[PDB]
Chains A and B, each alone.
Chain A
Amino acid sequence: NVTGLFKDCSKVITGLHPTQAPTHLSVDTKFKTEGLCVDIPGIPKDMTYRRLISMMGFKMNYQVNGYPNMFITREEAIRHVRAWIGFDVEGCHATREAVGTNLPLQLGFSTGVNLVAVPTGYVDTPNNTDFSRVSAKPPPGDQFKHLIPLMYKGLPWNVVRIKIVQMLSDTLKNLSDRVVFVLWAHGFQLTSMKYFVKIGPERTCCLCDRRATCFSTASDTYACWHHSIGFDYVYNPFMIDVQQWGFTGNLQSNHDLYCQVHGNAHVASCDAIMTRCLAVHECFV
């Protein structure tokens, strides 16, 4: 069968030339025969296309020696409760030139911080993948009316991911040597992490012996929460999906079973606060 990961969201009715298609499925039907593809002299390859590629459907279930796991067990998360940071993202829908994927719009954290980002997606070109702004619209609904003015108040992602690293460093440098993103329905949250998370083997800070929690693309260096000034990427974070703990219903209905002092759902930071709050009540009572 097929998966939604890397789904082509363009509105072009024709497929890709065999030299430009990333996969056999993306090849145009005219070239397919006997389960393979054939080159057709006279049908040139496209040199002006821009195809938005969906980043929904990541599966972080790899088992590679030397690489730590991103998703951790509940008992492991309980041990590192000091590193818990609730995380939720309100997204917008791609429109006009593409359709079929969501883009991160408002990133919220249990620290109460909301970061609005410019609708940015990954666009395949005849030469490479273009990380650039894409046309997007807020999702229909009255609970999403507060997202309409945010469509023209976002920041470039190079600035957003620096603010995320700065916020997490100021919050956790005296609490933990890592971060545990507390999630509810990790699907779109994991998609948003593609914009500001890098993974790899366990590294140490370039200035001390602490483990590396941040990465800088400008210097190819690693740092902990204390020495991450200017760094733009979160390195080897951990996370867990509270929705997979056997809950029935949405986030707020389960949060309200234990807590009555958090509300205002569908705002990114408020959902992140309720997620961490529900995780605390469920794990330690």
Chain B
Amino acid sequence: AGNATEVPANSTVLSFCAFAVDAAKAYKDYLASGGQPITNCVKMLCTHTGTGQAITVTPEANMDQESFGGASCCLYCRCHIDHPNPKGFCDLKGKYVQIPTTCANDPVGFTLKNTVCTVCGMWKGYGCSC
């Protein structure tokens, strides 16, 4: 009974971060020890003619980005654990997230380490120019 959601390649990293006190630190240290990034994300087939904004309601990837489902790029959604927001809300779930193509191999790691510029709506260091 039921429908599987994950693949065996993610079993180690997801189990490790699902038990950790600081899951963000756990995933960063997991990558630092040579661990494979979380795969099985929701990669979007899009026109790549989007605005390039970081977090959008529709895929807005440009020629230098890949579009992903927001929930699939959130470490806390992938591990089914609490989000750091005091209300428990998620900044990515229900939205699409644009990831630079050079960082598309680890979408979960990119959203965990980078911040969206509140002025122009693009990633600081990956689109922002404020």
Contacts and interface: CB of A to CB of B under 8 A. Distances in A.
Contact of A19 (B10, B40, B46, B94): B94
Contacts of A16: 71
A26 interface: yes
B70 A19 contact: yes
Interface string B95-107: 1100000000000
Interface of A, helix, strand, loop or mixed by DSSP: loop
Given A18-B69, A53-B80, A58 B4 contact: no
Given A19-B70, A37-B44, A197-B19, A2 B6 contact: yes
A198 B17 CA distance: 10
B32 interface: yes
A54 B2 contact: yes
Interface string B5-36: 11110111111101111100110011011010
Interface of B: 1-8, 10-16, 18-22, 25-26, 29-30, 32-33, 35, 40-46, 58-59, 69-72, 76-78, 80-83, 88-90, 93-96
Contact of B12 (A2, A19, A34, A59): A59
A128 B72 CA distance: 12
Interface of A: 1-10, 16, 18-27, 33-34, 36-39, 41, 45, 53-54, 57-67, 99-101, 122, 124, 126-129, 193-194, 197-200, 215, 235
Nearest to A58: B15
5 contacts: A7-B3, A33-B45, A38-B44, A62-B12, A126-B93
Given A198-B19, A200-B21, A22 B77 contact: yes
A266 to B, nearest CB: 23
B21 to A, nearest CB: 5
A23 B40 CA distance: 6
Contacts, number: 183
B83 to A, nearest CB: 6
A36 B72 CA distance: 13
A1 B19 contact: no
B5 A62 contact: no
B71 A129 contact: no
A21 B41 CA distance: 9
A38 B96 CA distance: 11
A10 B5 CA distance: 12
Contacts of A6: 5-6, 14, 80
A132 to B, nearest CB: 12
Contacts of B20: 198-200
Contact of A65 (B3, B7, B32, B77): B32
Contacts of B12: 59, 61-62
A113 B82 CA distance: 30
B52 to A, nearest CB: 16
A127 B15 contact: no
B33 A1 contact: no
B2 A8 contact: yes
